[PDB]
Amino acid sequence: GPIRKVLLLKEDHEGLGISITGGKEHGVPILISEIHPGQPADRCGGLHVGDAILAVNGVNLRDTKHKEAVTILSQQRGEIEFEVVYV
């Protein structure tokens, strides 16, 4: 599908509210496998199961290993930009 830019607002006591799978070592992108109800990703409205996360706050995640992506994603705070695509 089309590449999208999506804004997510997170408070400091929360996680992103997603589960991710995949990663470079598996030959696939960082993929959203869950959107947890009522948590920031669900609330932002623009992130969905099956979306590949291409970048977060300008950090490219297309060639990142699974745990690298976890560290990068969990570091982001507040108003967080995502670049995503559903394939």
Partner 1 sequence: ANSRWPTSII
Contacts with partner 1 by CB under 8 A lie at 15-16, 18-23, 26, 28, 33-34, 36, 66-67, 70, 73-74
In angstroms, what is the minimal distance from the CB of 54 to partner 1? 16
Token look-up 């990142």 returns 64
| Dist. CA 5–CA 3, nearest whole Å | 7
3-state secondary structure of 43: helix
Q: Of 3 and 28, which has the nearer Cβ to partner 1? A: 28
- Give the CB-side neighbour count of residue 5, counting CA atoms within 13 A: 5
| CB 37 to partner 1: min, Å | 13
Nearer of residues 21 and 60 to partner 1, judged by Cβ = 21
Task: Supply the minimum distance, in Å, between the C-beta of residue 4 and partner 1.
Answer: 20
Q: Tokens 């990663």 label which residue? A: 23
